[PDB]
Design a protein around this ligand. Sequence first.
Ligand SMILES: *[C@@H]1O[C@H](CO)[C@@H](O[C@@H]2O[C@H](CO)[C@@H](O[C@@H]3O[C@H](CO)[C@@H](O)[C@H](O)[C@@H]3O)[C@H](O)[C@H]2NC(C)=O)[C@H](O)[C@H]1NC(C)=O
Ligand SMILES: *[C@@H]1O[C@H](CO)[C@@H](O[C@@H]2O[C@H](CO)[C@@H](O)[C@H](O)[C@H]2NC(C)=O)[C@H](O)[C@H]1NC(C)=O
Ligand SMILES: *[C@@H]1O[C@H](CO)[C@@H](O[C@@H]2O[C@H](CO)[C@@H](O)[C@H](O)[C@H]2NC(C)=O)[C@H](O)[C@H]1NC(C)=O
Ligand SMILES: *[C@@H]1O[C@H](CO)[C@@H](O)[C@H](O)[C@H]1NC(C)=O
Lengths: 323, 331, 230
Amino acid sequence: FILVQVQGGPLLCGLLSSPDVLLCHVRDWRDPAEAQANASCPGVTYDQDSRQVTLRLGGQEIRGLTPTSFQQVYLWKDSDMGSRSESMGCRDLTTGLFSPVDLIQVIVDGNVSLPSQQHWLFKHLFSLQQANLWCLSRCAGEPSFCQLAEVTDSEPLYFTCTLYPEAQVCDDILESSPKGCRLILPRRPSALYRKKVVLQDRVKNFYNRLPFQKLTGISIRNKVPMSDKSISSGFFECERLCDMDPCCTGFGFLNVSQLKGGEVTCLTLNSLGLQTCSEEYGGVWRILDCGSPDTEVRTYPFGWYQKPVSPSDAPSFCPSVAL
Amino acid sequence: ACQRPQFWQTLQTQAQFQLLDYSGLLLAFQVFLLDELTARGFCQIQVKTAGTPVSIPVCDDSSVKVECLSRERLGVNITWKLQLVDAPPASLPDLQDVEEALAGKYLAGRFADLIQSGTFQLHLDSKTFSADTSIRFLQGDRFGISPRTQFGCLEGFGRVVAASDASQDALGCVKCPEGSYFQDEQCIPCPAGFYQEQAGSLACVPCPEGRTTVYAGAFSQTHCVTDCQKNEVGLQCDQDGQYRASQRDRTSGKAFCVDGEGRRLPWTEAEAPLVDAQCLVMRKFEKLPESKVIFSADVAVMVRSEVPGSLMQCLADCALDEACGFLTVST
Amino acid sequence: NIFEXQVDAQPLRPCELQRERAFLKREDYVPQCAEDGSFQTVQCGKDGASCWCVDADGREVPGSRQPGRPAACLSFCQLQKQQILLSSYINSTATSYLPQCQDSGDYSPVQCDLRRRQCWCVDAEGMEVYGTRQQGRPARCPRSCEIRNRRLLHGVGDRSPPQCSPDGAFRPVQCKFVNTTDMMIFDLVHSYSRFPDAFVTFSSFRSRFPEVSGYCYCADSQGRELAETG
Ligand SMILES: *[C@@H]1O[C@H](CO)[C@@H](O[C@@H]2O[C@H](CO)[C@@H](O[C@@H]3O[C@H](CO)[C@@H](O)[C@H](O)[C@@H]3O)[C@H](O)[C@H]2NC(C)=O)[C@H](O)[C@H]1NC(C)=O
Ligand SMILES: *[C@@H]1O[C@H](CO)[C@@H](O[C@@H]2O[C@H](CO)[C@@H](O)[C@H](O)[C@H]2NC(C)=O)[C@H](O)[C@H]1NC(C)=O
Ligand SMILES: *[C@@H]1O[C@H](CO)[C@@H](O[C@@H]2O[C@H](CO)[C@@H](O)[C@H](O)[C@H]2NC(C)=O)[C@H](O)[C@H]1NC(C)=O
Ligand SMILES: *[C@@H]1O[C@H](CO)[C@@H](O)[C@H](O)[C@H]1NC(C)=O
């Protein structure tokens, strides 16, 4: 049954029989500015549109008679849902956007802070084929949040479809390969699918090159080798990779391992840390960190680039990073 | 409240002329007239310096106001406002030099001649709106034939001296303080439930949804307060500003527990101190008045668990039963 | 006059195209163009007997034609403001953007929507510089030489980065390299990144690139090569 109490209004008490998808969990990142028209998750909507708050719970809309606070569903776990006589008077173009993830790469630390959106697809009407398609289609419908979609069948009544943002965590080593980068998920997933990154034709930000040559305490989001490209093409890709990451604050386009000849590398960052060693200053008197000979960040167009400074902060689901 | 006064920050002159349909959106004509004024250089002051001439802007989006007086004759208000921080002190040393640059042959005398001539017309989709030869100047509620300047304050600064006696006192502007916002030449205290921390602001930041301000004119984030903390009846509060579950009376050491709201639950008042953890379980039960109870045969749980050394404990047994629906206690 | 070295299509603006075509046909009206290639807001006629104002496309604004030079013509920023406001009155449209003009009449480098919610950088012709739209006023709008350099990295144009002033404008003297063998512009952006040590001296440069010669010229404010200065 569903129980609803709009703030200082009537109290609803819906009964449920054979639900298909429980959909909104108290702990889900919800889009802060999301149109109520687009099937906004919390059913309540149009508070005082004409002094009436419509409720679109279940499949049935209450008229709206309301002058919110509590809203919960309850489930009979040991239900006869899948095994019930019908006489009791009851009642593929998107799978190509994703690529399976080798579950081994996942590290399982239950304590990680990772926003998500949970769903329960009940097994009495969902086959594993359909559940994998419902979950993937829903991830592709949330283009601002979902990068990963995992499906689990470790429960007797329902499949679990939880959508994640990017879960990859890297170390701060300036290297061309993602070997110190791991996926950290709270639980072992039966199947983990990653949306394939699609590069738009044009760049969306006019990035500013930092005057500083040395960054301390950076936070890296991804490491991509670019040595199989022209320098112009690699820079163009590095710009559009930071465009696709809502948590990216800037990128590095640089040669790493310069003592062995250098490797062209793109590093997307969600924190620039402490920026030092400007070429404009420290001419006669330098005190801060300078002179890293295993890295080449000076020659055009190498450098550290910043996404343009805006007073609007990153999406709330982005990881918290501090010096 | 008490702040440092500042000097007058702006100078202002106003003229009126008439443009020669109704019940329509005239605010388009406010932009069109400003564009025509800008095109002919009546929104800049040009100062004949030695080398490069500095340009002082004397208009904004509020400079032109139009009202409909009669058919085919619109009424136009033009207001030139000079900010003194833009007037070059090397070219206009005294404030008198600034007044005459704003109300003389380079701005207002040059505009009166243009209107009196008859050569001001506005081009709007092949239609022509020529202006009448009559021009009037505000002189403090008496439209005269000569421009008079009027002193004022900047955007974030409240007036403290009346307009009329600006000739008497030079310090007429104070910055709106930390508890305040600016509207309409006055500094108005943040209303209750709102706070502002930085002076010279245009709005009041609301408190977090769980908190409010006890009085008006709050001037810090910490001044936003919860219902528990504002509480004056002595109820103690935990961190995060939530009511402490366990309470003790002011008069007597008698101890009681309160709900999520500050309502003091009866029937939990006991002489023995109650630890907060003891009130949490009792907060999850409700005591039924006799009118809701019927005395007749039913069936009792047969739990034979280690018998205590106790209502507080007895409730706790039900609180973890998962089958107990309710219980009764004897005397 | 501008005439670039290697390009097949000259970067001529519409006024400069209409001016050249008219001078060729010995018409009595030849459009007058600004140094950057825009129409001058005042367009004279044969001998200047009659003069009128025009919009950004050279179309005569009605009612402006006059014997003698018009006293004042609205700039292109101001003329765009009129056409937007009339449009809403003529054809109901809830405007979301009204251009902001400097007191000289040109477009303000930063342009904000009426909600003051989104802002972007425009060039000297009111056209949005791509990638500059954001929440709030952009801290620093890029200049023309910096924009040209960034678009070069995105595959637009030749591979020779123009030299920019500290303010971000074009330097008046522009220098590039020409491969004398195939008579093509030398790929400077990639050669400099891969061989920075070949650029220490001209001895080291011509050791690595023996067939490459220098080509310098005078550039206009848009970085275009002035004719017959190479
Ligand atoms: C960043 O790293 C890249 C890749 O490691 C560097 O590009 C490489 O540069 C070297 C030398 O400049 C090229 O090696 C060869 O040098 C000999 C001279 O003995 C020359 O005869 C060859 O034709 C060749 O140039 C190497 O080809 C080149 N690799 C690529 C993929 O372009 C680059 O120099 C580094 N950038 C900086 C600023 O250090
Ligand atoms: C144009 O300016 C005149 C003079 O400032 C305005 O007339 C004043 O209007 C206020 C508010 O209605 C009155 O309190 C004053 O008594 C008026 N003064 C005079 C001398 O009439 C007029 O309202 C302005 N028009 C517009 C459209 O702003
Ligand atoms: C200058 O242009 C000539 C083209 O005429 C380049 O020489 C050619 O180089 C390619 C390799 O990229 C060879 O396949 C051709 O056989 C070469 N042609 C000749 C005629 O030798 C030369 O490399 C260019 N120089 C620079 C510095 O770019
Ligand atoms: C994570 O936190 C939980 C409870 O807060 C704890 O049981 C667990 O040991 C923690 N994991 C660690 C410390 O690795």
